[PDB]
Amino acid sequence: MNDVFTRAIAQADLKGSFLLESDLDKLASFAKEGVKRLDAVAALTNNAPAIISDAAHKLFAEQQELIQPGGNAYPHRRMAACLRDMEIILRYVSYALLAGDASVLDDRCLNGLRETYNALGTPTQSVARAVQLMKDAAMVHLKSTANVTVGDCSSLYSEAATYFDKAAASIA
Amino acid sequence: MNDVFTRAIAQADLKGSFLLESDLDKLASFAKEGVKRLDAVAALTNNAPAIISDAAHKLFAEQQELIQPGGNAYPHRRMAACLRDMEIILRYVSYALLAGDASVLDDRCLNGLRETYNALGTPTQSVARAVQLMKDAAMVHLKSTANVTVGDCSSLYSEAATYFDKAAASIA
Amino acid sequence: MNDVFTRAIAQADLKGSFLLESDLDKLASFAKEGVKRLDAVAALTNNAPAIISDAAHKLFAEQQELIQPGGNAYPHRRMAACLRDMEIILRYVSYALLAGDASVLDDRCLNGLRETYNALGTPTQSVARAVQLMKDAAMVHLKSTANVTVGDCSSLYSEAATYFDKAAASIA
Amino acid sequence: MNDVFTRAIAQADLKGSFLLESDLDKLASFAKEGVKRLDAVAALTNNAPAIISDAAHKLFAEQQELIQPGGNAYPHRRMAACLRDMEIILRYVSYALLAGDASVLDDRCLNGLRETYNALGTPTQSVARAVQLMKDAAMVHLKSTANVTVGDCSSLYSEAATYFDKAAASIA
Amino acid sequence: AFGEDTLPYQRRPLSQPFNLTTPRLADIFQDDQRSPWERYAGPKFFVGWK
Amino acid sequence: MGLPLLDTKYSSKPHRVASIPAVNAEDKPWVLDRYDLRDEQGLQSFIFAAYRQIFSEHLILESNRQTELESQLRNGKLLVKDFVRGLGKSEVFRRLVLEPN
Amino acid sequence: SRTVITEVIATADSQGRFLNSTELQAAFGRFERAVPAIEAARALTKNQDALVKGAVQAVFKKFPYVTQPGEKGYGDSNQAKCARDIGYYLRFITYSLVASGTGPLDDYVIAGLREVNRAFNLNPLWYIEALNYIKGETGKLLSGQSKTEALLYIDHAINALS
Amino acid sequence: MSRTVITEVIATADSQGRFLNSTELQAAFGRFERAVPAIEAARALTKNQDALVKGAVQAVFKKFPYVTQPGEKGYGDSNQAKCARDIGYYLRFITYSLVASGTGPLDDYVIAGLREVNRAFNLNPLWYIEALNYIKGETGKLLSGQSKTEALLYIDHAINALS
Amino acid sequence: SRTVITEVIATADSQGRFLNSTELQAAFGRFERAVPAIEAARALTKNQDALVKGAVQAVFKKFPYVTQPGEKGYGDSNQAKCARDIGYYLRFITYSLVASGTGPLDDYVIAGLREVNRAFNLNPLWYIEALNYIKGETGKLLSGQSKTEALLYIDHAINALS
Amino acid sequence: SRTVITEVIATADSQGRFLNSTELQAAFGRFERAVPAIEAARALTKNQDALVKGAVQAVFKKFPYVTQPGEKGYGDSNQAKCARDIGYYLRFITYSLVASGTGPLDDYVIAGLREVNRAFNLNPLWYIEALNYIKGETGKLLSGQSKTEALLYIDHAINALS
Ligand SMILES: CCC1=C(C)/C(=C/C2=NC(=C\c3[nH]c(/C=C4\NC(=O)[C@H](C)[C@H]4CC)c(C)c3CCC(=O)O)/C(CCC(=O)O)=C2C)NC1=O
Ligand SMILES: CCC1=C(C)/C(=C/C2=NC(=C\c3[nH]c(/C=C4\NC(=O)[C@H](C)[C@H]4CC)c(C)c3CCC(=O)O)/C(CCC(=O)O)=C2C)NC1=O
Ligand SMILES: CCC1=C(C)/C(=C/C2=NC(=C\c3[nH]c(/C=C4\NC(=O)[C@H](C)[C@H]4CC)c(C)c3CCC(=O)O)/C(CCC(=O)O)=C2C)NC1=O
């Protein structure tokens, strides 16, 4: 399972060559923005309960059919599993955000998720909608400037957005 | 695993509504005839060796090619496997007769058994024939009026016949 | 997982017949030549590291792409897996040679090796070439008369060639 | 399995009060000197194999009855076991060094090692002697200041002596 | 593989986990569940800007 | 018991041939053991990892929590093999895993 | 779900044995107890509207502050969901009565209760108050033995919540 | 898939993930030496199969008179035929085991599932024990020296499993 | 309890191997981190009475219903227990600060939090927003990295209560 | 491959939790780690050729016999392969420096080293001595944190070989 440094190393070894000075410069810039990246990952970590709560509330406001008798989130058990899925996806997204590489999602979470959801009978578009709602919820907490040094981190916002979108696309 | 009551409950919950008075009356009648149902189930349980032995004798009179060298019941392990299969299917039929629903029989016994027999090279028509022979040898015992109160057990006889026919049709 | 005796007995049983005079004579001949057979299996077992080293030397002389970076035997753990696979296949050939039947080779070793290699990305024709190189290196050790009584062993050489080719063709 | 900070917090909770400023001062004094402790532990870790080789050589030198047959240290596998024991006790002393507490030493294995060596029959005073002499051998390496910035190391030496002798006195 | 002391774990490099690929149920119809083409036929209990 | 079982008819799998350490260290699953049970937070993590290995992390619900087995484990009167077996021989494992399949 | 019959069959099927005499005695007990339980289920089914509305009102009385603005009880939607949830609990109590087992409750309601209540911040005490109101009115609606059955199931739900 | 000397050797070498050491090929040499008396016994026992089976059937009837009267298992031509067929099976698998130098044929083809089949069809193990005792007596004469011991080992194994 | 050094030593001894680089110099990172954390602990230890007194009334402001008779907060003794609980939480935040890990807060507070809170019918939101007030007042008392430290440890406590 | 970040994520995922405080502290430690390590990698990448030539010449020097015909090290091809192998080791040490973890070295060089050496009759002491020469040379090339880090990874490789 690869982070950005290991991904660069794997590319270099496939070429069978030392790392370039340009690639070392890129990795050094990554290590420089690492503090901002840690702040974003910690924001997701702390705000995970509120993120999942907001996403669940909006999702079940939009799709009553899920929570109707016979729906895919009707009893307490299926709703609890739904919220567990939201937490699992948010957790793997935070993993990838820290590592700076989406290998965590693809390897551990999204490798066979659509086939699993089809086997269970789960509406997959609704899962993707929950992922997108979680993305919208998490952008608010990532943008929050309270108790954190002010700065520009739009690259991190775009990065987290593309991991959420990758998760949704692999699920949907 | 469902019985008649849980089948009714699940259907009502899918409709999202309480049980109608017609459904409760049906279940009351079921419970009232439950003592006769217990009699039939006990007749099947107590006479399992007799049923299996008679079915085996008849089957291996009809189909001698099973017990010839190169047949599918030739050595001792294969004959013991045959008798074991008959006992297992009789067990699940008695379960389905007590419950009142063929859900246990279909889910736990017959759901993938034809594929198994094909993978093992077993003649599924011979297995179905053995199941019908157990049907005959069993309804001999369910109809044994001796030692029990006389009454109309036609519904139970039909139910047992349907379970055995379902087994035979599923295997073959 | 049968020796030649067990295949004889199983083929006889399928017909439901005793073992004939000719079959018993052939099996007694096999037992008589089992002394040569033990010499051959010992010649394989004693010299296994030498056989694997010779095969690897020749194979990475002829196919340098295996050991270059980006190759399939390069990263120095894939080289260990290469040599380990060679030793496994040599071991199973020795098993088969002792038994007199290629059953153990076919079932315990090669059952799903082709698709395993395809999923990994391993060039299967190179693996088959390595098996053929092990055959070539092992024939010399088999034909060594040192410390062994001189005699005819052309049949054993043919059998060993058959087993090595069976492994190689299964992989390829 | 406790740290000096862990022990301080344990006593603070036991008395039910907050951590006193004197306790905080001593923790800060320990922490500011952390690189002291880390360099000592890391040098011990790196040079451990040489320490163990020297220790084995000498313990063979002064103590002779072991090496000949019949002693509690003749066989070769028994030599692997003795080397493992000296390695692990050195490692446990390293753990006590880094943690700054002997609870990581006393609780884990010293409790059971007593009855273990009583049941085995190997003398315990020889074990304590080997502990002391391996302490001397490791201390010699711990003196080595080359390749590292110069500084004082007396307190770490005192703590290491206390921990080695504590392990010996427990074993003895 | 594990013995009396170790907890079971998948003997595969874990970049391809089991529990993700294998669910507890696969391709069955459930009694409490409802077919995806079906729709709920029961009390609406509210009208939120339908 | 009764009759013997059929033949296994093996196939080539990574676990069968693993004389060489795995490709990635972090990708090796964690090997929980008796020592992990000595601590307390470690014991909670061990219990959760067992529930995740057997019950698949979606059945880790307070209704599904075997408390008798957990208390026996915490005592030290229960092996890890017996804890795993007791999770397998449980009402939740039959009702949630065996019945559907 | 889990009824008397289903536990009997599953216990037999887990040891791989035929249903023996003790199992049939338990099933007989179920079939004799079915009449009072079905009577209780019919009684609670006939009066579902009064029970649900009174339970919601008892919930509001016990916790007036919840219906204040910014709290969970304010708004038509939240009280409609209140009535819906109490209807769910009553429905599953009657299901458990008919099934003669706590299986419908243990599967539909209790399985995942803590996680869902903590996720949506639903106080269990609201539902315990509503179930206590249902418990009280069951005594008026039901006499003798059907009352005892309904009370067993409502108590099981209450203990599951608390 | 039988449990023979060669195959037990191969299986115990495979389970340990190692080559065949000295002792494995060593026991294999023992087996290959063993085979000549075993094949001699199997030949001398397959040649006399029909007389052996006939004598065994008659001996079982002599030792168990009650089975012969009407209303019992032994009454009827068909039960006669199946008695002869069962004893022929036992003899054939004893010869198989002799040839294979192991109890794999008996333990797999006859012994496994023996009790269940006997119980289901109400077959008495003592009938076959008496038949095998008669066959043992006759192979006491038919075989000389090593071959007699080799045949008696497997007949005794079958008798022990019947009991 | 659990600390970074404790994690290092337990992991190293579990495999029976000497310490690897990451372990050593993550312990280095902790040794450096000790300096701001201990200052944060001292700062939190100075003001404890004001923090607890503010927390109790912050709870009362946010949740008034707990004060009226028949509720948990009513009575002098119950409010004293409230103050004691908030003092416990603050002391364990300081303990985590000096320990550089959530260890003391996890074994001393989180371990068995939910069942104990449920048995005594203690609503966790009380403690949640009391901890929120404590976070707000650390918003002024502290400055610099120590600030973040305190905040995150309080973070963890909140994360575990919900 | 194993790294600080990668083991952080693996540990978090094993326990089914988000990254807590200590995990991000270790991540911060590695992020500060990177700079001296990346300068070490740049210095070793600039001076790869002289280092390789010195290592190969030292291997010949302290093993004069292998240079002679009839031995392993004789020949142009064998010595070119020696140079290539030392280039491999230096490249993977630079990889470990850049990754700030022994993931690359363990992944490529260490995993399966013994079996390959035994099968091809490659004496580990040659590579140990070449690593020792590289240790000495970087004793001159680097200083400060970078020297310590590079020596640490070279020592890891040396212990793995020996
Ligand atoms: C490796 C990481 C991982 C993921 C991602 C994962 C997803 C996952 N969710 C599952 C169940 C489920 N998943 C859902 C989720 C849906 N419900 C509603 O439709 C929502 C729209 C939607 C969620 C937002 C539900 C309701 C279930 C319950 C199905 C059941 O109980 O059978 C299952 C079936 C396994 C089981 O229940 O034991 C898996 C594998 N599992 C994993 O181990
Ligand atoms: C103990 C756990 C830990 C954390 C949490 C951590 C994060 C962290 N963030 C920092 C500053 C910062 N943090 C951010 C990121 C934020 N800026 C805001 O505007 C964005 C909403 C947000 C983006 C996610 C930025 C831009 C800086 C300024 C310094 C820099 O960019 O390098 C600093 C340097 C202190 C300073 O000079 O301000 C640290 C150590 N490090 C740790 O060891
Ligand atoms: C692998 C070797 C093998 C054996 C050994 C074997 C025994 C065997 N004998 C059988 C029949 C039988 N065999 C006998 C034997 C009796 N006949 C009497 O003359 C004697 C007293 C006595 C023999 C000494 C009898 C009575 C039956 C009929 C039992 C019945 O069907 O009710 C059957 C049931 C098949 C059928 O109904 O025809 C088996 C399985 N089967 C095998 O495949």
Ligand SMILES: CCC1=C(C)/C(=C/C2=NC(=C\c3[nH]c(/C=C4\NC(=O)[C@H](C)[C@H]4CC)c(C)c3CCC(=O)O)/C(CCC(=O)O)=C2C)NC1=O
């Ligand atoms: C609860 C659902 C269920 C059932 C019932 C089931 C039956 C079953 N029958 C089997 C083999 C068998 N089944 C039979 C029986 C058939 N062949 C005979 O000719 C008869 C005509 C006929 C029986 C009336 C035989 C002879 C075998 C042995 C095949 C063999 O050993 O190769 C086997 C595998 C072989 C073993 O492990 O011993 C199973 C699992 N499996 C299930 O999961």
Ligand SMILES: CCC1=C(C)/C(=C/C2=NC(=C\c3[nH]c(/C=C4\NC(=O)[C@H](C)[C@H]4CC)c(C)c3CCC(=O)O)/C(CCC(=O)O)=C2C)NC1=O
């Ligand atoms: C401990 C296990 C158990 C057993 C053994 C059992 C048998 C049983 N059967 C009964 C009545 C009965 N049993 C039967 C069944 C018979 N009708 C035909 O003759 C068939 C041969 C046969 C069933 C196929 C019938 C029809 C009744 C009377 C039904 C009624 O009066 O309501 C009764 C009640 C006596 C009565 O109604 O006066 C019992 C206890 N019940 C049990 O709980």
Ligand SMILES: CCC1=C(C)/C(=C/C2=NC(=C\c3[nH]c(/C=C4\NC(=O)[C@H](C)[C@H]4CC)c(C)c3CCC(=O)O)/C(CCC(=O)O)=C2C)NC1=O
């Ligand atoms: C330690 C395990 C073990 C081994 C290894 C073994 C082999 C073995 N080979 C023998 C002779 C023999 N060995 C061979 C085989 C050789 N013929 C050709 O030279 C080939 C190069 C070569 C085999 C490939 C032959 C043909 C005989 C004589 C058999 C005959 O009469 O034709 C002998 C008898 C000679 C004596 O004891 O003096 C033995 C015991 N037996 C064992 O218990």
Ligand SMILES: CCC1=C(C)/C(=C/C2=NC(=C\c3[nH]c(/C=C4\NC(=O)[C@H](C)[C@H]4CC)c(C)c3CCC(=O)O)/C(CCC(=O)O)=C2C)NC1=O
């Ligand atoms: C019976 C169980 C047993 C075994 C197997 C065993 C092997 C063994 N050989 C040793 C030393 C040795 N081994 C050798 C032999 C090798 N070294 C040179 O390179 C030679 C060229 C080469 C000989 C072919 C030598 C010369 C030593 C002496 C090293 C020393 O202690 O100074 C040692 C170190 C401790 C000692 O014996 O003093 C062991 C354990 N010792 C045992 O008690």
Ligand SMILES: CCC1=C(C)/C(=C/C2=NC(=C\c3[nH]c(/C=C4\NC(=O)[C@H](C)[C@H]4CC)c(C)c3CCC(=O)O)/C(CCC(=O)O)=C2C)NC1=O
């Ligand atoms: C929990 C951590 C741990 C401890 C505490 C430990 C000590 C230990 N030493 C043992 C035997 C032993 N102990 C020794 C060492 C003694 N004999 C002489 O060499 C010396 C005087 C002295 C060492 C200085 C030896 C040689 C054995 C082997 C006895 C045998 O194999 O029969 C045993 C018995 C089981 C085994 O060796 O695997 C243990 C448990 N091992 C551990 O994994």
Ligand SMILES: CCC1=C(C)/C(=C/C2=NC(=C\c3[nH]c(/C=C4\NC(=O)[C@H](C)[C@H]4CC)c(C)c3CCC(=O)O)/C(CCC(=O)O)=C2C)NC1=O
């Ligand atoms: C990879 C893990 C790691 C290591 C190995 C490490 C060693 C290390 N110790 C340092 C400070 C230091 N370290 C020492 C300790 C040394 N003095 C002597 O007595 C002994 C050889 C040894 C103690 C046993 C000293 C004296 C300093 C100078 C700072 C001071 O103590 O005032 C420095 C900063 C260099 C500088 O001052 O510019 C490093 C890199 N740091 C790390 O993060």
Ligand SMILES: CCC1=C(C)/C(=C/C2=NC(=C\c3[nH]c(/C=C4\NC(=O)[C@H](C)[C@H]4CC)c(C)c3CCC(=O)O)/C(CCC(=O)O)=C2C)NC1=O
């Ligand atoms: C007991 C029966 C059995 C066999 C034989 C078997 C072989 C086997 N070889 C494997 C990998 C491999 N196999 C090879 C060998 C090939 N690559 C090069 O082209 C060489 C020329 C050539 C060797 C002749 C290599 C290099 C790998 C590693 C692939 C990787 O690590 O990604 C794997 C995948 C698991 C792993 O080792 O990582 C298996 C299962 N497994 C079994 O259960």
Ligand SMILES: CCC1=C(C)/C(=C/C2=NC(=C\c3[nH]c(/C=C4\NC(=O)[C@H](C)[C@H]4CC)c(C)c3CCC(=O)O)/C(CCC(=O)O)=C2C)NC1=O
């Ligand atoms: C299997 C049976 C079952 C139950 C019981 C159940 C309860 C339940 N009620 C919910 C909403 C709700 N339920 C209530 C109930 C409150 N309303 C009043 O204020 C009262 C004080 C109190 C009821 C006594 C409220 C306020 C909400 C909205 C909470 C939110 O949206 O965050 C939700 C969130 C899902 C949604 O509808 O969007 C669930 C799961 N769900 C089920 O599938």
Ligand SMILES: CCC1=C(C)/C(=C/C2=NC(=C\c3[nH]c(/C=C4\NC(=O)[C@H](C)[C@H]4CC)c(C)c3CCC(=O)O)/C(CCC(=O)O)=C2C)NC1=O
């Ligand atoms: C070291 C870890 C630790 C914690 C965290 C802790 C909290 C704690 N507070 C308790 C009592 C209590 N605590 C409160 C305080 C609540 N009610 C209001 O005043 C406030 C809004 C609110 C506090 C924020 C009350 C009312 C009780 C009495 C509960 C009862 O007896 O019914 C109890 C039960 C003890 C008893 O009932 O005798 C615990 C366990 N105790 C510990 O040992």
Ligand SMILES: CCC1=C(C)/C(=C/C2=NC(=C\c3[nH]c(/C=C4\NC(=O)[C@H](C)[C@H]4CC)c(C)c3CCC(=O)O)/C(CCC(=O)O)=C2C)NC1=O
């Ligand atoms: C990823 C890291 C990696 C390593 C370390 C590695 C070692 C390695 N070196 C090799 C070649 C070689 N290596 C050597 C030994 C060297 N030549 C002598 O001049 C020196 C004394 C000595 C170095 C100090 C020799 C003589 C060969 C060619 C002959 C042979 O492979 O046996 C080979 C065999 C390649 C082939 O078959 O052509 C391997 C596997 N391979 C790898 O992929």
